[model samples]
Target: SVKSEYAEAAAVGQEAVAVFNTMKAAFQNGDKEAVAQYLARLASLYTRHEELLNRILEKARREGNKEAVTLMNEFTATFQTGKSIFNAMVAAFKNGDDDSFESYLQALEKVTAKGETLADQIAKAL
Candidate 1:
């Protein structure tokens, strides 16, 4: 059970990296369809990952692991900020606002880089 717990956390981080990396490639290659596909994948993945992180963070709190609680709190905050920017990108895309979509995507790229490292720390701490 503990093994799977660690695996799940690590897997989510890995998948996020994979999806974003592929999305970046698609963007560079001018594959609009693939970019849309990956954006949808990220939206779903973010939802699931946040839900699980909340559960894990709650357990850490109950067990009196202050460091784990703090780490997860920061991770969650970073993740949700990314999600918020992602939402804006989606809105801009839907509205045909190319400039806004590009802006939000750039913002998300920076936030995602931060989260990737934070996720590694979180997986190790857990």
Candidate 2:
């Protein structure tokens, strides 16, 4: 059922959220090192989420499920946006500029928010 599928996706999203919260807290605590670590973890989590999403999309396409396919398309678009934001944040962090750091943090927040939104959408589609 869609609900059960969404439940599974939500479980994954919850883990991602935990990682994001940890990263935010680390930043707020002035633990730059931990921030880096958590960011890496978050990246990995997102990557995995993308992989799973792709698989779901592929399955939908194979089964000729128009609704699922459309939802997957939307999910991919949003996911790509979020992914780009994370890439930019990582690059900024690596660059080591005060402005870059600030901008990166803001982008991180935006990306995380988008992620949550996308998760909800995907859950609904499921």
Candidate 3:
């Protein structure tokens, strides 16, 4: 059962990556409706990612690895920044201000770049 939990988490992570890719594609295409739908999906994926990571941490706590816990905390903080960027993008889209949308897109590119790097790092780690 314990190993099964990790298996489930891995499945969720795989799905999340797929959803993230969909969101990226929608953004690239500049399809507002698709973007909105994918963003919502991405949000759900992110939430699941956080939940799974937290569960992992809780399990690790029983073994008392301070370093692992610290790393997870750091990861949580980084994820929060990514979430904030996404939230800003959604807000900009909702506002429908041309200037703000442009600025948000520019910022989004940087955010996405960071996310790509993070994804690579995670892949390597996994």
Candidate 3: regions farther than 4 A off: 1-14, 97-126
lDDT against the true structure, each candidate? 0.80, 0.73, 0.65
lDDT of 1: 0.80
Choose 2 or 3, whichever is better by TM-score.
Answer: 2
Model 2 over residues 1-126: C-alpha lDDT tens digits? Answer: 444654665677679778877776776677889988987888888888777777777877887778778877877887787778778777776776547766766876776676576566656655
lDDT of 3 by residue, 1-126 (tens): 324554576687678667766765766677778877876886787688778767866765676766656655666667677678667767877876546655665775576466555444433332
Query: Once superposed on the true structure, which residue ranges of model 2 sit more than 4 Å away at CA?
Result: 1-6, 111-118
Please state the error at residue 31 of candidate 3 in Å. 2.2
TM-score of 1: 0.83
Give the C-alpha miss distance for residue 118 in model 1, angstroms.
Answer: 2.8
TM-score of 3: 0.66
For each candidate, what TM-score against the reference?
A: 0.83, 0.80, 0.66
Q: What tens-digit string does per-residue lDDT give for candidate 1 at 15-117? A: 8778988987886687878888998998888787777777888888887778878988998899889889989988886787778977998898899887778
Model 1 segments more than 4 A misplaced = 1-6
Ranking by lDDT: 1, 2, 3
